[PDB]
Amino acid sequence: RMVDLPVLQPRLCTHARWPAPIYGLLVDPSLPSNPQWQNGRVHVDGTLLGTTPVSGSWVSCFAAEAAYEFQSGTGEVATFTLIEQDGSAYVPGDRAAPLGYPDFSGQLEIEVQTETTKTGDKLKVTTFEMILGPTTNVDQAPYQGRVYASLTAVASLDLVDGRVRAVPRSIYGFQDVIPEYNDGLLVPLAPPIGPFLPGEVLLRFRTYMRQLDTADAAAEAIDCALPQEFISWFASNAFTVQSDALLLRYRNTLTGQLLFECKLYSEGYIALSYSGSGPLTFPTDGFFEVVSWVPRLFQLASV
Amino acid sequence: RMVDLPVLQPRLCTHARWPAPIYGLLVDPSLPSNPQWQNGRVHVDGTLLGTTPVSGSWVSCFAAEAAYEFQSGTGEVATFTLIEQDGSAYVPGDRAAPLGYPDFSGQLEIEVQTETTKTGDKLKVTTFEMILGPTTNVDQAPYQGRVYASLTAVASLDLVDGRVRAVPRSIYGFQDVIPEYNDGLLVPLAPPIGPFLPGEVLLRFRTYMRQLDTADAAAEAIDCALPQEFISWFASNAFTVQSDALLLRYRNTLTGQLLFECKLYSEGYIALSYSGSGPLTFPTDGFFEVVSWVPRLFQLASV
Amino acid sequence: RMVDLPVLQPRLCTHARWPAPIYGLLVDPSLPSNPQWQNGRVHVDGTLLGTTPVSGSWVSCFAAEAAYEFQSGTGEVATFTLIEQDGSAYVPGDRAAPLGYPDFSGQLEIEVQTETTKTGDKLKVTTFEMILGPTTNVDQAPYQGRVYASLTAVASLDLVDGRVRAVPRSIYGFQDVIPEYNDGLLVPLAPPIGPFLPGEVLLRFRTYMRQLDTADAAAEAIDCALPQEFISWFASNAFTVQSDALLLRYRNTLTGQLLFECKLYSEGYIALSYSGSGPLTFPTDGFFEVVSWVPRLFQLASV
Amino acid sequence: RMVDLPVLQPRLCTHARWPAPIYGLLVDPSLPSNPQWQNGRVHVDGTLLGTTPVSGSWVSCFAAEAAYEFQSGTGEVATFTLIEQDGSAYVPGDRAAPLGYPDFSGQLEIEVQTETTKTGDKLKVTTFEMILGPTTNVDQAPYQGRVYASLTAVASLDLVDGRVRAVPRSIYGFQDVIPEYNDGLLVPLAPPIGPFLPGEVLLRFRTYMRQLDTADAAAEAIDCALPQEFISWFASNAFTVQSDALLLRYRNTLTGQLLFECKLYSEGYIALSYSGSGPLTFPTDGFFEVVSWVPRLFQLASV
Amino acid sequence: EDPVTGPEEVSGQEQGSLTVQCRYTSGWKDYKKYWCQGVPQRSCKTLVETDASEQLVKKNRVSIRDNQRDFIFTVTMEDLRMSDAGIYWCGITKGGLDPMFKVTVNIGPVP
Amino acid sequence: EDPVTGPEEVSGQEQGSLTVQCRYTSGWKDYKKYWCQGVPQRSCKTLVETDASEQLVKKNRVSIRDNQRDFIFTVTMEDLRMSDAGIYWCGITKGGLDPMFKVTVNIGPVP
């Protein structure tokens, strides 16, 4: 069956690298042209790349067996022995980390369900600080299945060790650079997004992350190559891939007017022909439609 | 084109009523048989019911214009003037609330991005407590677009009014009962799930919510009728519906062994013919496949 | 078009494995007969093998994104995330390293442009020490795109992270053995040079590297199969290959006297028929001329 | 045989005036329009002009017999008796200096292999400072075969006199003006590049040199008329020159799209018709192709 | 300056009675006062509420009377049972969030 | 604040013994400690290494024992020969660049 796409508008879709709605659609040649994002990566034939999960609820989260301890001078320290978020054992293999593990850098505030032995309480939700990267002095190694988090406290919180699911609360010092997956060593990674033709630029689906910032109030943008609905759409359909890219049309939902034509490369990224120097945003209430297969050298009309 | 289903395993899918992975698949005749869940409701022809959103990042969340104030004896008080989660205006209409608003009861901890006026700080993430239902003394009216939240504080947090996205952090005193949608008055609701034939019971997709509990450590279960991936799958395809139900087969992914057959009613819920009196859980690493259209009175093989 | 060669003299050519002029031309049966050099490898039809670049300015150099930090007891530490020397992204593929990366062993002194934040200074040229191989305790992995270097310093140099081009300054403890390409694991390599007929030995183009040695003042020789001009000559012309080898004559430029006949094998190396036991050097101011195609079994006249 | 050009891309070529890759391709009428560069000068028939060498490893380097001594109040002082870089004697003749000698001005850091008598060391690489020009008070006379370099030191380095090859480490106070070739006296020079037609400007192949700068972090650009690969291409092929110029087309390697047409004058420089006043850069992943011979007055299409 | 205060912990005995005094600031005089039961706080079940007057109101075993001179409304729980134990709240009804104060009630048998 | 320290120069005698103490900071307690030989520094030949425990390890004539209370691992070289002379290193195994301290070992005859 020939590849098709859902009629979903981007503004009603889920971001693939941070669990939030998609708010923006744009091209920006001033940003890095070939990002090596590890989440939100799928081939059109349905092969997931990097750490990309099928469910958007796995994005920028992790699951682990948690071991807690109090360290004087630092506070409550958590050692997370990672597991895949469905409960299957994490085995180091041909990807950077467990599925859905964050693929960006900064200090991430995470939330976990904790059980305490203190009388009068039983189940709580505790916020931990976890440094992702680019470099840390904590020796994070999610590739090996071990990450560390901490929280300032004057005494032990008396937490009970056990299974946890960690969800992201905020990001501090965000950088769109892959984190420390293996204590400074490199890991199997999905390759950089690309290549592009002359004049082609990556189409970006943008959301904004909850952040901690002591001076700047501007929202923190993060981009992904495809909405999560498109990621699971390809994973479910398992289309056969014919050419190197698909010619798509982005049209206004109500009128049908064509907003731009673009190429969905089979490697999982959308390209537009745009020669401008600054960002160019597009309406988020349109829809994509598959036109046909095209070769790599197919020249798009400029937008 | 004849109705088909994604090959996705339930354990890799997203829950439709609480933003978490699906962990369980079961029937339980001791639970309410015709729940009136407002999220996770879609017809097989693609019509969304109740407050069901397409994106899982909308589930049990809301967006609003936030106004903050300090009230002695209460704390920091938030008045949320609701808006649809994509920014389009919320108009009270033929559903209970904005799309994705919680459809359960209890005390909900929510997180929002807050801006402060304190010198040296700017952007923080603040946890608020918001009572959902079943009844409140707060006059919650999400149907009208106004809800109230609070957090204990000894003084004002010096928050700046502005736009927010609120995501759920934990549930306290959970009840699977619709919340106070309109200050005690009734609202347009999706009908109860059903009806079922004699001996037919609802198939439940289960996750467990982060909870606050001072005594019991047992996980808090919440069920939905379909994975969020299935809701958006039907919403995208707009299938033509022929009969009243679809005969489905749930099979093991690796071996192919048939685990059970079931009926996906066109109204958007799955029924099993089940002769037991107690709960029966099923493996979550299987897949659903459509067999054919069947009439309402079609008799299933018992489980 | 029949293969021809430039009349350029070896003494006026560029070495293909260390960026220096060619100073010697010789055969030596006491050295390893079948070296697996990764630079300076080209087929006569123009196919580049291993990490061989076309431009001589790429030879034994690398380009990277540099990350700096100070570590007491070690000094200023550089982490080089490799990139191809033209700025295009380096992707681990069907060769050992980025094009032009050193294919020998020892401790390499490299030079990079560094920017500092120290008041009164801005741009300097800094020498780093980088271990190549044969084995290291550093986990060098140029195949994955990450290598580490250091330089002794009593305090931080306050270097700014950024892009660099690294050129070789000197070699310490040189060994003509492929370096640690992948943290001890194997990588795709160009095969050993060969095979040769009985009595045939490899013709070596020799230069001498800037070296560090605390006792021995004798120059450090390094050999390559072809001058860099011949590599770019074959890469540019894309000749059609007829037989297994080309019969060459090395004649004096002024008088024309024939110095030796040799076979240029299609795999990109020259063989001479030489029965001696010790080294035999030849004048470097001669010229090569193509005579005709010959089969692999063509027996050369002894020198 | 009609003149043709290799399909080599500029970004994969070697710069002809500084030993580095080519990073930029541009025209800039605000720069000196008729430069008298002495390196990187060749006729299309293969005739080398000025000090231009065939091998790129000779570019901005020199060879000498070195004499070292310590002078209190100055430091270690080096007297270099220049020699041609292949070891043949340098004789003052019809050019400015030995082949490859730097043709720009500023303070050049050079590196040479030095042997020491100090116990515990033997072979080192020593960095010297050498003033090139435009004017010096040290009486540099590379045309005569004698230049001086020095490095500050509190005591003698115990250096041994001997043969050296000097390679450039960094440039300080760079000026694209010919150095002091003969102690203030005039020398035989390659003529200024030109002439051009009305509206024609010189095409520049640009690299950036390792520099010393205490305030400005902007890269230090240096331009040449042709890539070093083109110089050795004309020197090796010895084409017959017919007209005053060659009509060339610069096309993108992947698509084949025409970027501009230009005139390669037989005197060894490329002209584009460009009426702007500021710089105009071009993509570096194209290739040049010969169209035909044209007269000097052939009018190019504007770019 | 809390809007409404009371005892943090009170204890009664089976078949006995207990009394709870809820003090409030003068501004809440003309507001309805109530006594509610259970957690979560703001979904508790109102057992008895005044009509903003000083009339005594009795519903089942709970009584309430508002003293609008001393600004204290008094709750009385009669014929106590073990199932009466739990968290209660002094409450003042307003639009939105009510002034509320937590009262823990323990019930035991007679020795 | 150096990670690992030791003697800059030690001298032994033929058929004799020498001992080398490498002190490290507390943070490196649970890391493997080693004694390696030769130059270049970071391509040296590891003679003996611990398993990050306090167990004594011996290979041929070289021994290693990590004291994880005083943060000193002690290297012992027995039955020395003149050919044992050279550059050695106290080492702590890590990802990337190892903490290493240069130890020069001289061996002479007995008078």
Ligand SMILES: C[C@H](CCC(=O)NCC(=O)O)[C@H]1CC[C@H]2[C@@H]3[C@H](O)C[C@@H]4C[C@H](O)CC[C@]4(C)[C@H]3CC[C@]12C
């Ligand atoms: C106590 C918590 C329930 C509350 C919770 O954290 N829910 C997640 C959410 O609200 O998003 C339990 C219930 C089910 C548990 C998960 C499931 O048992 C599946 C899985 C099993 C692995 O052994 C550990 C990880 C992992 C993934 C478990 C982590 C902890 C969970 C999530």
Ligand SMILES: C[C@H](CCC(=O)NCC(=O)O)[C@H]1CC[C@H]2[C@@H]3[C@H](O)C[C@@H]4C[C@H](O)CC[C@]4(C)[C@H]3CC[C@]12C
């Ligand atoms: C300050 C925050 C960004 C941080 C954040 O809260 N992100 C949510 C998350 O991380 O999940 C801003 C950035 C974009 C904003 C949203 C968009 O502007 C669209 C929309 C506009 C409406 O006026 C208010 C709601 C709504 C939906 C906005 C809520 C607040 C958002 C989400």
Ligand SMILES: C[C@H](CCC(=O)NCC(=O)O)[C@H]1CC[C@H]2[C@@H]3[C@H](O)C[C@@H]4C[C@H](O)CC[C@]4(C)[C@H]3CC[C@]12C
């Ligand atoms: C600051 C230096 C310029 C000085 C220098 O190191 N020149 C090299 C030499 O003299 O041989 C900059 C100028 C241009 C830069 C290069 C170019 O931008 C191209 C390329 C871009 C990649 O992102 C990083 C590597 C790489 C290859 C860059 C390395 C650093 C360079 C070479």
Ligand SMILES: C[C@H](CCC(=O)NCC(=O)O)[C@H]1CC[C@H]2[C@@H]3[C@H](O)C[C@@H]4C[C@H](O)CC[C@]4(C)[C@H]3CC[C@]12C
């Ligand atoms: C000690 C150095 C070798 C190390 C070195 O400096 N290599 C240059 C590099 O690595 O680029 C020796 C080895 C061969 C020597 C060269 C050859 O003997 C040929 C020639 C002879 C002339 O009398 C002096 C210059 C010149 C050209 C010599 C300069 C010094 C060289 C290059």
Ligand code: NA
């Ligand atoms: Na920020």
Ligand code: NA
């Ligand atoms: Na190491």
Ligand code: NA
């Ligand atoms: Na400068």
Ligand code: NA
């Ligand atoms: Na109220």
